[PDB]
Design a binder for this molecule. Structure first.
Ligand code: HEM
Ligand code: HEM
Ligand code: OS7
Ligand code: OS7
Ligand code: H4B
Ligand code: H4B
Ligand code: CL
Ligand code: CL
Ligand code: GD
Ligand code: GD
Ligand code: GD
Ligand code: ZN
Lengths: 401, 402
């Protein structure tokens, strides 16, 4: 049982929960690989017992009448069909629990508040598009963002798969040149290469919202134009730097992740987009200032008349911070939910405390919980963490080609 | 079959074959990763020694030669006859440089070849130990043109207790507990401060009182030594544009000299071997001055800056910390005392990773320690995946002697 210390306060806890890790991680006694982003059939019933057992534990209902009962239909379902369907209440328990278990998510204090839309009866490409469009509208909710997940049918053998080819529902295009450089977003150049390679009209500039490539089983992806009034976006201005708005910067409201595989009770949903609300450092620090993203830090510093000729002026730092100020200011003005990294990390500490009493610990990926600016100014920096894999879970999955 | 490692900023990919030589075992398993935790018989002595001699004869391009087999036999004989062995001076210098090179939490390892090694293995008392340390401080400080140095005291050996420096660094500020329960000066140093008084030191009562040295010679209680004040170079902190900042009366010292770690070379242990380089500005400006459990000045600075401290979304903490770091950089540059900013330091560490990949097939590195504690993703190390593992020679943590 690993001893975990908070160095700001001196408190000690033990992560007893780590004793239940399933799909093992990449670290060995001889080398740690925690900084890697991507770490390297009669047994469907094993991890299916597991989940049902977890479900009935929570609701004060382990070992009696109802718990005994639900254990049988699943074995009989898999004995008959080789797979099984989840009760609606289980699908919601599994959606939230998988969120609770996401080690890289700093927003887990919200894990109990989740809206689960059950698209397990989906049928075609036009079908998911309606399911996804209901999602965006509901999640966006005019800027009062509401966490949601839309769960499409569980994969079965012999036939294809529902899969959203976009990494997110809202993603900006990226346009090359004779010189390879990108107008727009370089994280979305490949998918842009496919979206054009499927009929779409590539726009002019930097913040063109990409269309959607949705994949009904076995058939080629169908493009789907997203209705403009569905895609809520925020123009970026600064509270005191009047020229910031003239830079023409924009970001979208809904962070809606559509490429991860939800796994509950041994079942696998390759299309299950979840969405919450942004933390501001995501947009301002990573999306706008990463050197392989919009990479605007130097342009903002020029406009602030900063001395970019020596690193010791901390011009990168000063410009980065005002970018984050502008992100927060703009979103709050447009009345769109956003959380600064100080507020977010302080809530995660409260979540860690809640999980200690609830489950005896919490899986947490230190490198992803500490924000990309001002890390030691947040409490999670001084908090030791244990990272392991619990089920149910969100997993990474290969790109569908 | 070795870990693949990607740099996400550029798209680079390398494989860390060096990790396969990991001579000892860290804290993680495939069950759970503990990478974020701060703190994780002649036959084995001979096999460590053999690996090291092999390493040394590799460096001098003499692997497997006559002299090399000679040394393996000599070391085998001395362990048989005495249970231990003595390094040659040239092996000691190699060994110390290599322990630096292997240190996964050091961002300054581009410098690992430029290390002054002071052989104090003939040191006989606390009083001689103190003279050695004073010469270390004077050489490394060099009037603000800092030089990396290590002074290595006698190794652990059977029959005799250890040399130990009780202080965690050669230059530390006192931390006076109080009632009302708060700490005046540096709260990281309350324990060592109390021990100095209990061993006779007359305490001060300021916030920046340099501590005496508590020096332990084998099988002897520690002995207190005052540093000559003209040997301890300090930097008073001013901000280039916020002129009220000087009125805070903050100071920091020029020399960072870690004195409580254990140097391991070829199975030998040196429990007293202080080493020093020069500061990276974030250690002072961010950690030492802004950590809530250190001097904790952030809010008082942000109030003086007229920031809006009642809501977090104004990023008042970020803005005040950036200016504290600017003051640190400015003040050391003004005083002509070596300092590197986290941008320049992480850039040179990236060159170190390239040099090492070509030299050795990898580099052990602790991401959470290499990534600076402000402006993380603005530096290139943030976007570099890294493999953490333990190589020998090494600097190791050891328990406090009390
Ligand atoms: C409600 C407010 C939420 C906030 C503020 C938030 C914040 C974050 C942040 C900042 C990250 C780091 C990702 C990055 O830096 O690119 C993250 C990762 C993640 N979050 Fe959340 N999140 C929220 C809700 C949710 C919800 C509703 C789910 C799922 C039901 C979720 C599951 C995850 C997962 C699986 C990851 C891992 C992403 C990856 O590994 O690529 N979070 N979250
Ligand atoms: C010359 C310039 C140097 C710079 C800029 C530098 C920088 C740093 C920094 C920023 C850290 C992390 C410290 C912390 O957060 O508390 C560190 C740790 C460390 N450095 Fe270096 N260093 C230098 C020289 C040296 C030398 C000469 C040695 C040994 C011969 C060394 C060995 C270490 C070790 C062992 C650690 C780990 C300390 C620990 O784990 O507690 N460094 N260094
Ligand atoms: C639920 C939620 C709320 C919120 N506010 N932010 C969230 C951010 C992410 C998130 C994490 C990592 C990512 O990158 C993976 C990657 C892919 C390819 C190459 C490199 N890296 C991406 C890029 N799609 C998004 C996920 C969920 C979030
Ligand atoms: C060689 C060099 C150059 C440079 N510029 N900076 C350096 C900083 C450190 C360093 C690392 C960790 C530390 O923490 C230990 C601790 C103990 C107990 C409780 C909490 N923390 C301390 C505190 N003395 C210092 C080491 C070497 C450095
Ligand atoms: C190499 C390194 O692991 C990589 O840059 C990680 C670091 N921490 C991160 N943390 C978050 N939240 N998101 C990220 O994309 C990353 N990237
Ligand atoms: C809990 C956490 O590991 C701890 O606060 C670490 C994080 N990274 C660090 N990085 C450096 N350079 N120095 C430190 O003291 C720490 N502390
Ligand atoms: Cl994003
Ligand atoms: Cl220090
Ligand atoms: Gd101007
Ligand atoms: Gd001024
Ligand atoms: Gd005051
Ligand atoms: Zn690990």
């Amino acid at each position: 049982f690993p001893r975990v210390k908070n160095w700001e306060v001196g408190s000690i806890t033990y992560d007893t929960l780590s004793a239940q890790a399933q799909q093992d991680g990449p670290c060995t006694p001889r080398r740690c690989l925690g900084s890697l982003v991507f770490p390297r059939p009669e047994q469907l019933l094993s991890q299916a017992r597991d989940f049902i057992n977890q479900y009935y534990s929570s609701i004060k209902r382990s070992g009696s009448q109802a718990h005994e009962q639900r254990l049988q239909e699943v074995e009989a379902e898999v004995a008959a069909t080789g797979t099984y369907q989840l009760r609606e209440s289980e699908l919601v328990f599994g959606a939230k629990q998988a969120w609770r278990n996401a080690p890289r998510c700093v927003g887990r204090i919200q894990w109990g508040k989740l809206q689960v839309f059950d698209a397990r009866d989906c049928r075609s490409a036009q079908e998911m598009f309606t399911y996804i469009c209901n999602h965006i509208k509901y999640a966006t909710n005019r800027g009062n963002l509401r966490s949601a997940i839309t769960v499409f049918p569980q994969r079965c053998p012999g036939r294809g798969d529902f899969r959203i080819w976009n990494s997110q529902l809202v993603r900006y295009a990226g346009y090359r040149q004779q010189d390879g450089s990108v107008r727009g977003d370089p994280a979305n150049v490949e998918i842009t290469e496919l979206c054009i390679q499927h009929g779409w009209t590539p726009g002019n500039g930097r913040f063109d919202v990409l269309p959607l490539l949705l994949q009904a089983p076995d058939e080629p992806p169908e493009l789907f134009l997203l209705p403009p009034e569905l895609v809520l976006e925020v123009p970026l201005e600064h509270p005191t730097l009047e020229w910031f708005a003239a830079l023409g910067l924009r970001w979208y409201a809904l962070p809606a992740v559509s490429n991860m595989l939800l796994e509950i009770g041994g079942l696998e949903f390759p299309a299950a987009p979840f969405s919450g609300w942004y933390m501001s450092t995501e947009i301002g620090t990573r999306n706008l200032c990463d050197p392989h993203r919009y990479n605007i830090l130097e342009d903002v510093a020029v406009c602030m008349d900063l001395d970019t000729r020596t690193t010791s002026s901390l011009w990168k730092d000063k410009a980065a911070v005002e970018i984050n100020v502008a992100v927060l200011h703009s979103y709050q003005l447009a009345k769109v939910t956003i959380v600064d990294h100080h507020a977010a990390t302080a809530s995660f500490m409260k979540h860690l405390e809640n999980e200690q009493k609830a489950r005896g610990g919490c899986p947490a990926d230190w490198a992803w919980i500490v924000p990309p600016i001002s890390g030691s100014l947040t409490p999670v920096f001084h908090q030791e963490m244990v990272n392991y894999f619990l089920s149910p879970a969100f997993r990474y999955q290969p790109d569908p080609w």
